[PDB]
């Protein structure tokens, strides 16, 4: 409350770490069905579908212009990425399970980053 906080938490190297994080996402070898936006003239019912659309270049981009105000926001958005793939992607195709395995591997990398 007013003139009562907590321990001040180093959040100075977050921007870098959460960098770092995103390249090894960049760099996994299922990150394919992720690494750009979903082309929406291409991919019928993805417009209309998916309110908001989310890709590893666009958090790239907004990481890289100071559009993350805090560690919780760029997590919130890689989630989002996975949870668009869960919503038109069958888990029993390439791309559904290329979205689970990467949700793990950014889960562990967070909890291992951060918590």
């Not at 390249?23 to 996994?28: A, G, P, S």
Request: with cysteine; net charge neutral; aromatic share 10%.
């Amino acid at each position: 409350s007013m003139s009562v906080k907590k321990p001040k938490r180093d959040d100075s190297k977050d921007l870098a770490l959460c960098s770092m994080i995103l390249t090894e996402m960049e760099t996994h070898e299922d990150a394919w069905p992720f690494l750009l936006p979903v082309n929406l003239k291409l991919v019928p019912g993805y417009k209309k579908v998916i309110k908001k659309p989310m890709d590893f270049s666009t958090i790239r981009e907004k990481l890289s212009s100071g559009q993350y105000p805090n560690l919780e926001t760029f997590a919130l958005d890689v989630r989002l990425v996975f949870d668009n793939c869960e919503t038109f992607n069958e888990d029993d195709s390439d791309i559904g399970r290329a979205g689970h395995n990467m949700r793990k591997y950014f889960e562990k990398k967070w909890t291992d980053t951060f918590k």
